[PDB]
mmCIF file with all atom_site columns, C-alpha atoms and ligand atoms in Angstrom:
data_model
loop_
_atom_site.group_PDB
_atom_site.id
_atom_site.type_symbol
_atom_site.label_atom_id
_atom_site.label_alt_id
_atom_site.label_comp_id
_atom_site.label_asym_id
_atom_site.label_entity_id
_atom_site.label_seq_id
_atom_site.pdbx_PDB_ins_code
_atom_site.Cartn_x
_atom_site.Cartn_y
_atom_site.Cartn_z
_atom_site.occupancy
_atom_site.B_iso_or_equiv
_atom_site.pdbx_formal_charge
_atom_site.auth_seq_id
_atom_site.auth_comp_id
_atom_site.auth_asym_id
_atom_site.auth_atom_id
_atom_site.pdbx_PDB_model_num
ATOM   1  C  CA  . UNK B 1 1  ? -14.833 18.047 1.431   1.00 46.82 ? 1  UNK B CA  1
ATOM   2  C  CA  . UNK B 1 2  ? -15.624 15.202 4.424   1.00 43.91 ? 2  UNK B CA  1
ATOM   3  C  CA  . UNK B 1 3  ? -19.167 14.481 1.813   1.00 44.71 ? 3  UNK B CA  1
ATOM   4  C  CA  . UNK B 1 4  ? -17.682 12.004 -1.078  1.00 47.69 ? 4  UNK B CA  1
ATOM   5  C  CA  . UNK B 1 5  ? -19.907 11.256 -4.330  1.00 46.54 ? 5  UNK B CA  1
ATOM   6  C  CA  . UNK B 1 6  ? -21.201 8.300  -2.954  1.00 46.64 ? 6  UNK B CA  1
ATOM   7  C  CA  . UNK B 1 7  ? -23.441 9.966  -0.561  1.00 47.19 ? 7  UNK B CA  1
ATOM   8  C  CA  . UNK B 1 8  ? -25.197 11.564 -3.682  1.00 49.30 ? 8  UNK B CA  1
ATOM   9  C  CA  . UNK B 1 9  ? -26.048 8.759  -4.910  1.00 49.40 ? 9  UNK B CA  1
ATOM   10 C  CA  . UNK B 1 10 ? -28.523 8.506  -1.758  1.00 46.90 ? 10 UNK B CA  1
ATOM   11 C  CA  . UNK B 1 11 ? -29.900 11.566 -2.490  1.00 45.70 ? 11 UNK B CA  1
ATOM   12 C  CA  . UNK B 1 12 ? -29.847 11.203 -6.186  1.00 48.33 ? 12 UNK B CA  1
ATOM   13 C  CA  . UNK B 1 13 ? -31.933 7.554  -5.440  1.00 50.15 ? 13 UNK B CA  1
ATOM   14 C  CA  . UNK B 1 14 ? -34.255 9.329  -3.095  1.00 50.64 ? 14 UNK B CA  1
ATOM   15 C  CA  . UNK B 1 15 ? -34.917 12.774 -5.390  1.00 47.50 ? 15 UNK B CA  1
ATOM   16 C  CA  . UNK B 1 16 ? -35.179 10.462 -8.279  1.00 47.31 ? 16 UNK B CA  1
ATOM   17 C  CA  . UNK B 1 17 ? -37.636 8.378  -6.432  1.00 49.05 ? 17 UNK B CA  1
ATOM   18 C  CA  . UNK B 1 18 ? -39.676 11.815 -5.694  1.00 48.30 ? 18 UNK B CA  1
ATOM   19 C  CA  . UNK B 1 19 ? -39.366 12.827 -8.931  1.00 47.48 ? 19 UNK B CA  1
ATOM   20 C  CA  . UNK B 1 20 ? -42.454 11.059 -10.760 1.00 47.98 ? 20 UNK B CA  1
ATOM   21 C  CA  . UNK B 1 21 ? -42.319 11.444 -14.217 1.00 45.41 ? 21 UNK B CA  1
ATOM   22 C  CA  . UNK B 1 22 ? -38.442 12.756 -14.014 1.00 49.34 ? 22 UNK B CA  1
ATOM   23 C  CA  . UNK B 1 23 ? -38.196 16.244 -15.374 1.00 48.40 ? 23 UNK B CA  1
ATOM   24 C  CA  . UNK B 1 24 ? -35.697 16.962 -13.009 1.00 49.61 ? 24 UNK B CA  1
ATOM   25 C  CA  . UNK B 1 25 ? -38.338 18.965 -10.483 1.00 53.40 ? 25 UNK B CA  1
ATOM   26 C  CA  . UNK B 1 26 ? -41.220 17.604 -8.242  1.00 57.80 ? 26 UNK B CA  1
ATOM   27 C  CA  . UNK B 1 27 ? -44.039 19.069 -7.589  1.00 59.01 ? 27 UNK B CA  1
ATOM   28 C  CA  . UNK B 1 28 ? -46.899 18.744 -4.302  1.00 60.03 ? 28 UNK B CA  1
ATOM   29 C  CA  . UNK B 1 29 ? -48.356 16.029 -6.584  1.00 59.59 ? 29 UNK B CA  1
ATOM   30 C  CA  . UNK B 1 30 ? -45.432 14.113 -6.893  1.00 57.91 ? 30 UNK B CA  1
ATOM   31 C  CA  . UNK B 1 31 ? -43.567 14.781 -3.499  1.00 60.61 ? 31 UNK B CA  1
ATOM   32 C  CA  . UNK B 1 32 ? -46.857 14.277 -2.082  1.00 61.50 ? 32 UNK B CA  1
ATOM   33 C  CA  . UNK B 1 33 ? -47.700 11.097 -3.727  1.00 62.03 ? 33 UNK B CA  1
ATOM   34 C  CA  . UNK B 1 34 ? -44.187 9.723  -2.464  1.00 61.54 ? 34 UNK B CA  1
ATOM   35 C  CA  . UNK B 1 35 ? -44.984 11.171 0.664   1.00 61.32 ? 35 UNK B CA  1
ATOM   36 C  CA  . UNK B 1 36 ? -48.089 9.075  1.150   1.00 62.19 ? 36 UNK B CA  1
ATOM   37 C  CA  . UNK B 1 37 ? -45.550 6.582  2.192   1.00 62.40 ? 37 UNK B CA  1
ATOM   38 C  CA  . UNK B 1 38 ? -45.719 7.890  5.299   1.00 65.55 ? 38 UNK B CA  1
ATOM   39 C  CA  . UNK B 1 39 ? -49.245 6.708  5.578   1.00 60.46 ? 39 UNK B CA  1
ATOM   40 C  CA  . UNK B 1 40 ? -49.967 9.297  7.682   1.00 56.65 ? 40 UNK B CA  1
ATOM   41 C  CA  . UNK B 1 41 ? -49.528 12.851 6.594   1.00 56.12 ? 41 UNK B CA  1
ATOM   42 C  CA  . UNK B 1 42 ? -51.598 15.629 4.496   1.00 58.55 ? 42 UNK B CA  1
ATOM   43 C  CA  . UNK B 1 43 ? -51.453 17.580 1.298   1.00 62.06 ? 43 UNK B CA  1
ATOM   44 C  CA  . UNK B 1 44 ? -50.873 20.960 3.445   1.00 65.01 ? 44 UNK B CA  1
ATOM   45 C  CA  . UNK B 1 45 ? -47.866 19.950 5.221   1.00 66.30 ? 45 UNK B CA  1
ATOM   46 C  CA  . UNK B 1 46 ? -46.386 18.354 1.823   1.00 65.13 ? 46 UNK B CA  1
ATOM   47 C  CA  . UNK B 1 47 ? -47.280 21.883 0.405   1.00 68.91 ? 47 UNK B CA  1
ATOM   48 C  CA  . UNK B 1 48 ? -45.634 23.424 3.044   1.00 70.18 ? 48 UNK B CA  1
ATOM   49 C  CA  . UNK B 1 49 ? -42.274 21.518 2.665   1.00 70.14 ? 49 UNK B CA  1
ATOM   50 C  CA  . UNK B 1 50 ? -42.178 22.715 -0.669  1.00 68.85 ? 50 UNK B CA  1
ATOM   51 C  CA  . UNK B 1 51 ? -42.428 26.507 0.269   1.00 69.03 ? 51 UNK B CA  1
ATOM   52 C  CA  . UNK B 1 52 ? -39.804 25.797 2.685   1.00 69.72 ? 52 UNK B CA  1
ATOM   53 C  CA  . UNK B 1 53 ? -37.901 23.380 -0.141  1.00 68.48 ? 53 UNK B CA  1
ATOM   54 C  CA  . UNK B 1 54 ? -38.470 25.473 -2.867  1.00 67.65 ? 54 UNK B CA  1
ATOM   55 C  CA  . UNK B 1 55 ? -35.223 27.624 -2.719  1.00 69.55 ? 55 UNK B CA  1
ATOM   56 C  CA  . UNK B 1 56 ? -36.632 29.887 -6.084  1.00 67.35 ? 56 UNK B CA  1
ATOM   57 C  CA  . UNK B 1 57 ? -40.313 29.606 -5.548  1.00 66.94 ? 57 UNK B CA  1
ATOM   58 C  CA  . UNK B 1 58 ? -41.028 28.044 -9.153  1.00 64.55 ? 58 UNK B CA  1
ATOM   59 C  CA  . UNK B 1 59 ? -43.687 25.708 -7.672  1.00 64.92 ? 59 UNK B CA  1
ATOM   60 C  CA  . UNK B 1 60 ? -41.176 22.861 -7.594  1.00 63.27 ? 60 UNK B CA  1
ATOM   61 C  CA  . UNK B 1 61 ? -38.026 20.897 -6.137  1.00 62.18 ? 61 UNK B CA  1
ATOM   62 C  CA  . UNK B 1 62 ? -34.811 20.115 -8.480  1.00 63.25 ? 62 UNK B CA  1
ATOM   63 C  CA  . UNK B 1 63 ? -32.206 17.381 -7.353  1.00 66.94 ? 63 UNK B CA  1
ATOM   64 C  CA  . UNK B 1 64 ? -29.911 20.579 -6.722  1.00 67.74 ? 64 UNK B CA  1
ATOM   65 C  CA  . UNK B 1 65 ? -32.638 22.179 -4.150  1.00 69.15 ? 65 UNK B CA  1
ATOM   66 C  CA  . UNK B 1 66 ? -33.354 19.063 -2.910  1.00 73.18 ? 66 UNK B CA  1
ATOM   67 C  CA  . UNK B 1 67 ? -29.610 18.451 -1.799  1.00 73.60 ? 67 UNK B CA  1
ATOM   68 C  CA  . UNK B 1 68 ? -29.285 22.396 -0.266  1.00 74.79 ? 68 UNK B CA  1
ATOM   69 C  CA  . UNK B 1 69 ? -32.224 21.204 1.527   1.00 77.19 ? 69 UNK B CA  1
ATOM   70 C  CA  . UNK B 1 70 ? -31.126 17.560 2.205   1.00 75.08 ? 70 UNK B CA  1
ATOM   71 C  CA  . UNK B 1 71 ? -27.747 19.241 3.748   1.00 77.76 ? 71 UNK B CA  1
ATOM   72 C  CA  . UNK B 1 72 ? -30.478 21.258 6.534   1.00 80.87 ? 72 UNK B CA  1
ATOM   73 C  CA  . UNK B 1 73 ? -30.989 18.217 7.603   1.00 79.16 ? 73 UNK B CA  1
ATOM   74 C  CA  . UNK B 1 74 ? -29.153 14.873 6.604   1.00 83.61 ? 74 UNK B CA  1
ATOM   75 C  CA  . UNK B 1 75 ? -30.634 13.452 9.304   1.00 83.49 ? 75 UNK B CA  1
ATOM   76 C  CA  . UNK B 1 76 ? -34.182 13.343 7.820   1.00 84.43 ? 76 UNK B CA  1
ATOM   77 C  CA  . UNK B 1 77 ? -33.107 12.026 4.463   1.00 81.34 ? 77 UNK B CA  1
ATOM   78 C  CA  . UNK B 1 78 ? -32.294 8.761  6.822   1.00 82.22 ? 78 UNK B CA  1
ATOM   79 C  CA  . UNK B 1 79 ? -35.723 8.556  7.586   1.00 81.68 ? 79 UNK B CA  1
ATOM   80 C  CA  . UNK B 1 80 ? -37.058 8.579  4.008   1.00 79.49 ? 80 UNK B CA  1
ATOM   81 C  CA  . UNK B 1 81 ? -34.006 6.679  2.609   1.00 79.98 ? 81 UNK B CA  1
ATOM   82 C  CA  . UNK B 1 82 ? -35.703 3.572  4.887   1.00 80.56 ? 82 UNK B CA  1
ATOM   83 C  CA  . UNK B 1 83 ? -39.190 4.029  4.000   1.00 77.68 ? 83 UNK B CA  1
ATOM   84 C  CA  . UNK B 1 84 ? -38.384 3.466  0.557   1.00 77.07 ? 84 UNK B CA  1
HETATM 85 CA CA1 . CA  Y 2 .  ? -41.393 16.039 -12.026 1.00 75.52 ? 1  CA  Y CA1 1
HETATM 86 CA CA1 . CA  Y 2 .  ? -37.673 25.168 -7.308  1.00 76.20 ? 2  CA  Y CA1 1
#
């Protein structure tokens, strides 16, 4: 109960960034393409976040996955949440 609706609205902002043409799921393409922010990553390990992301397998990320996942690790959502 400690997580209030505010902090979805960080996640919501950062999934909806992902999110490119906003179907509700991203794909390698898209997460990858926001990924590129990075300036310094690959298509394989954006891939491979989405196998790990993915919690059905369906080839893409929804705002709920996203926020299972984003709860593994708050801590990295911090990191993207500036780089945006
Ligand atoms: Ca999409
Ligand atoms: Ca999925």
């Amino acid at each position: 109960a400690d997580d209030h609706p505010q902090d979805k609205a960080e996640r919501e902002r950062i999934f909806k960034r992902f999110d490119a043409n906003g179907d509700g799921k991203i794909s390698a393409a898209e997460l990858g393409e926001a990924l590129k922010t990075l300036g310094s990553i690959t298509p394989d390990e954006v891939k491979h976040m989405m196998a790990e992301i993915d919690t059905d397998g369906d080839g893409f990320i929804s705002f709920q996955e996203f926020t299972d996942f984003g709860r593994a690790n708050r801590g990295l959502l911090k990191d993207v949440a500036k780089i945006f």
